[PDB]
Design a protein around this ligand. Structure first.
Ligand SMILES: Nc1nc2c(ncn2[C@@H]2O[C@H](COP(=O)(O)OP(=O)(O)O[C@H]3O[C@H](CO)[C@@H](O)[C@H](O)[C@@H]3O)[C@@H](O)[C@H]2O)c(=O)[nH]1
Ligand SMILES: Nc1nc2c(ncn2[C@@H]2O[C@H](COP(=O)(O)OP(=O)(O)O[C@H]3O[C@H](CO)[C@@H](O)[C@H](O)[C@@H]3O)[C@@H](O)[C@H]2O)c(=O)[nH]1
Ligand SMILES: Nc1nc2c(ncn2[C@@H]2O[C@H](COP(=O)(O)OP(=O)(O)O[C@H]3O[C@H](CO)[C@@H](O)[C@H](O)[C@@H]3O)[C@@H](O)[C@H]2O)c(=O)[nH]1
Lengths: 360, 406, 406
């Protein structure tokens, strides 16, 4: 049993957070985004996980080895020297996955959902064909790749990577199980696996589909970060309601780290996650915001649907709304209103912004 | 024996949401290479026993229209005539006024086709259902979105007997999803109820949908034949471009010799592209999907054309990019010049989205849509035209953005 | 002996002035009752010793142009001839190309007048300075505002010697406060620099401002002469109203019989109002300031007109209010219909005025300007046309606000 995790791209994602820490490492409900997936892979029982990274990082290798014996499972990573698309990681890691004949998971870096892997491997063994794909019913399917399926067997009749015509409602959930025979199909030259090999495999009929149960969300967008965290808080409340804190001054689904310290008569609204080491003063109302680690917010401030970066000092009487992302080491002055401002790191702000624009 | 009546409009009744052409008639506008009513004429000539084709509309007979009639008569070996109303008599008034010319010869039934629709034209299927039941009115019907249905004429039917129980014309509220497609089949008895409507007007102009269809609905006189194929209405410029895309995709099943092949020695072609034989395209040019080129067009070295329509005699010089734009005839685009438009299109998440058309101004703001270049418009070198409507015989000198250039 | 050369444009130079211009060339547009070049011809005929007037343009001769020439010859007792360039030769290429027709008779000096300018035309005072200096180029100039001067040709002069030290044509940044009026006085030796430019172009179009005036400046060839009288240029359709206001205020010193008196038996009149003798005005109507009425115009009973030009053949029914608009030839306005516009004039001296742009749209919305109605536009009763441009032969059904009706 092996598993591949698809990292890279360096941009288009949650950029003010991605400038100081890589994308799979940024925290998401007090855990990194990669760490959720590899913990779920530990739950699945895979012996070995490889991750393809398009640029080498010191602190990522640091974090993954220091996590990697706490997990007790070795995890290796492969560096590509040109971005060979999303298919190139399969061909570069071919022999490492191909010395034994056992089907392997391929996971995107940004997908977070309920992880069905133990049921999905028995589905893969039962249907017996080459490639299995998780699919989910979504409301806006133009952004994602769209598959049509069968009634009972789940054979994928057609796969389109970008629809633009409404051929179906169900999308690629983003979780693949690939046989070793698919490794020899793809060449080392840069291709796209979601576009190229799944379409020819669909008209062959080796591709099969499986319906995910709940609360799938893509966390690539900086806007979709907040509603994905909002959905994950509700699903974790349904599964483990003890882990969410309950208090007289906090309402809704609140997930507080043990290292976080909160003042009194401050009203934390629904779907708020506080990182480790944050300090909230008295009289801060926070609704639908995530707060990353080491960040201190001053008193009497209102924050709706905001992302606060690490070691981020926020002034007194500060209002922030409309997916405003704060970055690495931002010092917002007192009595400022930020509507829609994503902030470049290591920058202090002196002017309240009426309209949403990137503050460099 | 059957003839077919095509209701081409008049000049005032077009009232274009974006003017696709300022100088040629709307029914002679080339959609996917051939004029707009030539699709109707060809699909009517394929039907067996088609004796004649009539065009009713109050255009004055300019020489382009009569020259098109010269060409079409000897192309399809059918007599194609033009009957001009003396005044704008409405949709069904021109049918009643010219009843002696249509009824002569005693046709078994006769088609009525709107000129502005772009459709599959399943005239044989409608003819088989009509030969089965011989009812006076047969209507083509299509399935539409709940929001988009308020623009067309909604039809409530009995699902078993396929008879209209209720008809309403552009309703303010949602009524039904089936919409009238502007294609009808008329038995010779069906000119009798029209006459009745005429007498009520004396106590001239008969609107066919509001006075005949919306009054006689439910009384066993109107039957709807549902259909499946492609359907759009050519109201605006963007809907003309989308209808041209629909016809270029339809061309694979009927005329594979019309679409340009890949041709690795010549110019690059991706997607469905119509190139005229007289047009000379340089081999370095690459023509993207859904592109029609007219007769006598000299597409230069290095041109990129995507989602465009180039009328006859236009010249594009080197390294120009033309995206989502209608280029009028005789127009010249200088080198490194870019003509761009915005494809409003249809929603990709909606199951049955029908691509609405909007009349040039959303709520007092000009909205971005297909760039129109008028006839004999000279775009100078290294200049950008974006989301603009350029009137004819105008030579620009600077870049224009989101403007109607008078 | 002196003659005058009036550079009228061609059909391409009148496209900026296009909505009104479909019916008649831009130089034959009636500004303050008479055609636009007729002011130039009349002010040249008022000069003593004017032998001939030549109009140089590339308009094709039709009945409006030659009918104007036949009228103006017998009106001013002067031969008015039209020389037609074979191609658009620029501002100075037409002057050089017809040099034998200009120098025929050996005149002592000849005036050169742009056709688009509305000005005082103080040609006599320029002549009295030219007889003092006898120099090749004399330029009428006027002071303008610091932000408005960038669109006109700027002249940096020495105040003591009255000589163009420097000339920059439509500069990006501020150069000088005086602008070129577009009225010049040419010696017969002034065709010697132009010839040199022609030779330089071969080793045949010559632009007068960009080639002759820019290189010749500062070398003793070009001299300035400053006027303080009224000056404006008619480059767009809404600038004709402002130039008509300037001419109607100029009319008191030159033609006191042209402006209508108050006439307490007849219609109430405030400000300067020109009424043609053929025009039928109801006595209940009141006409505000700066209003011109064409020939054969019927104005209804109770009508208000302020700052508006009503062209000839137009019909205003009763109880209507027309502010800031140009009502085209044969246009009809139904009862209780308001046609409004917002004031906007070149006004070079003023800082508030929006300066020349071909754009007409700021960010997808029409800028507030003068309402134009083209030829034969039928406005229905009880309907508002505000800030809107209506193309010719278009009948409207409902009230349009801030739109261009195509
Ligand atoms: N090494 C490497 N990895 C890459 C590269 N490009 C993308 N990846 C990884 O491949 C995954 C997909 O990249 P996206 O570009 O974000 O794809 P998408 O627009 O989100 O759509 C994909 O995911 C959807 C589900 O989230 C699918 O529905 C859709 O079909 C498609 O697979 C991401 O985790 C990204 O890290 C690359 O060039 N090199
Ligand atoms: N002879 C004549 N023909 C006319 C006249 N007015 C319109 N026509 C032609 O009749 C056809 C439809 O006329 P419209 O009145 O503009 O109908 P519509 O708003 O476009 O909608 C109609 O067609 C839709 C599909 O295109 C239908 O869905 C809808 O029910 C309705 O029938 C067009 O081709 C138009 O050119 C006229 O006065 N005289
Ligand atoms: N014969 C001929 N006449 C022409 C041609 N082109 C223009 N004219 C006439 O020449 C005059 C000005 O031509 P433009 O090229 O449009 O100049 P402009 O933008 O109006 O600016 C000129 O006049 C301004 C005052 O009106 C000046 O301020 C400016 O510096 C410049 O001289 C107008 O009467 C125009 O009709 C031509 O090609 N041939």
């Amino acid at each position: 049993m092996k598993a591949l995790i698809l990292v890279g791209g360096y941009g288009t994602r949650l950029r003010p957070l991605t400038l100081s820490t890589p994308k799979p490492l940024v925290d998401f409900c007090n855990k990194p985004i990669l760490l959720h997936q590899v913990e779920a892979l530990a739950a699945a029982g895979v012996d070995h996980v490889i991750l393809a990274v398009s640029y080498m990082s010191q602190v990522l290798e640091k974090e993954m080895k220091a996590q990697e014996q706490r997990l007790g499972i070795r995890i290796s990573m492969s560096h590509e020297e040109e971005p060979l698309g999303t298919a190139g990681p399969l061909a570069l890691a071919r022999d490492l996955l191909s010395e034994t004949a056992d089907p392997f998971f391929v996971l995107n870096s940004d997908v977070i959902c309920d992880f069905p892997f133990q049921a999905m491997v028995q589905f893969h063994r039962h249907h017996g064909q080459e490639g299995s794909i998780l699919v989910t019913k979504v409301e806006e399917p133009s952004k994602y790749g769209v598959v049509v399926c069968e009634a009972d067997t789940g054979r994928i009749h057609r796969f389109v990577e970008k629809p633009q015509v409404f051929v179906s409602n169900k999308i690629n959930a983003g979780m693949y199980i690939l046989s070793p025979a698919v490794l020899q199909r793809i060449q080392l030259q840069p291709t796209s696996i979601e576009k190229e090999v799944f379409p020819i495999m669909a008209k062959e009929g080796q591709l099969y589909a499986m319906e995910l149960q709940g609360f799938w969300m893509d966390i690539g967008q900086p806007k979709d970060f907040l509603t994905g965290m909002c959905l994950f808080l509700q699903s974790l409340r349904q599964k483990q309601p003890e882990r969410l804190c309950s208090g007289p001054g906090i309402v809704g689904n609140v997930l507080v780290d043990p290292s976080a310290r909160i003042g009194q008569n401050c009203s934390i609204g629904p779907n708020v996650s506080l990182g480790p080491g944050v300090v909230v003063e008295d009289g801060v109302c926070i609704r639908r915001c995530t707060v990353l680690r080491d960040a201190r917010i001053r008193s009497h401030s209102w924050l709706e649907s905001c992302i606060v970066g690490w070691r981020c000092r926020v002034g007194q009487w500060v209002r922030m709304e409309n997916v405003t992302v704060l970055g690495e080491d931002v010092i917002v002055n007192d009595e400022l209103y930020l509507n829609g401002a994503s902030v470049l790191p290591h920058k202090s702000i002196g002017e309240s912004v009426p309209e949403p624009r990137i503050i460099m | 024996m059957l003839k077919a009546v095509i209701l081409i409009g008049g000049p005032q009744k077009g009232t274009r949401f974006r003017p696709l052409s300022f100088e040629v008639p709307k029914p002679l506008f080339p959609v996917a290479g051939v004029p707009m009513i030539q699709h109707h004429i060809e699909a009517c000539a394929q039907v067996p026993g088609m004796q004649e084709i009539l065009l009713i509309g109050f255009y004055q007979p300019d020489e382009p229209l009569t020259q098109f009639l010269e060409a079409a008569q000897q192309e399809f070996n059918l007599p194609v005539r033009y009957l001009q109303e003396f005044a704008p008599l409405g949709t069904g008034g021109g049918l009643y006024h010219f009843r002696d010319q249509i009824l002569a010869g005693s046709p078994e039934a006769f088609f009525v086709l709107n000129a502005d629709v772009c459709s599959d034209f399943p005239l044989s299927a409608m003819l088989e259902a009509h030969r089965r039941q011989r009812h006076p009115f047969l209507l083509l019907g299509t399935t539409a979105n709940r929001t988009q249905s308020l623009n067309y004429g909604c039809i409530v039917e009995n699902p078993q007997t396929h008879e209209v129980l209720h008809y309403v014309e552009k309703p303010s509220t949602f009524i039904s999803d089936i919409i009238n497609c502007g294609i009808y089949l008329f038995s010779p008895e069906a000119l009798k109820p029209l006459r009745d409507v005429f007498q009520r007007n004396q106590q001239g102009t008969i609107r066919l949908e509001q006075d005949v269809f919306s009054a006689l609905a439910g009384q066993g006189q109107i039957y709807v034949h549902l259909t499946d194929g492609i359907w759009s209405q050519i109201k605006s410029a963007g809907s003309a471009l989308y209808a041209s895309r629909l016809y270029l995709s339809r061309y694979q099943d009927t005329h594979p010799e019309r679409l340009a092949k890949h041709t690795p020695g010549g110019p690059w072609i991706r997607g469905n592209v119509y190139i005229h034989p007289t047009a000379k395209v340089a081999p370095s040019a690459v023509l993207g999907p859904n592109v029609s080129i007219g007769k006598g067009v000299t597409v230069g070295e290095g041109v990129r054309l995507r989602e465009s329509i180039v009328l006859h005699g236009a010249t594009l010089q080197e390294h120009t990019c033309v995206l989502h734009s209608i280029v009028g005839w005789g127009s010249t685009v200088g080198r490194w010049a870019r003509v761009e438009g915005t494809p409003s299109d249809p929603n990709p998440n909606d199951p049955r989205a029908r691509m609405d058309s909007e009349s040039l101004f959303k709520d007092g703001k000009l909205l971005p849509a297909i760039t129109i270049l008028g006839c004999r418009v000279r775009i100078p070198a290294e200049v950008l035209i974006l989301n603009s409507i350029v009137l004819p015989h105008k030579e620009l000198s600077r870049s224009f953005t989101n403007q109607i250039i008078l």
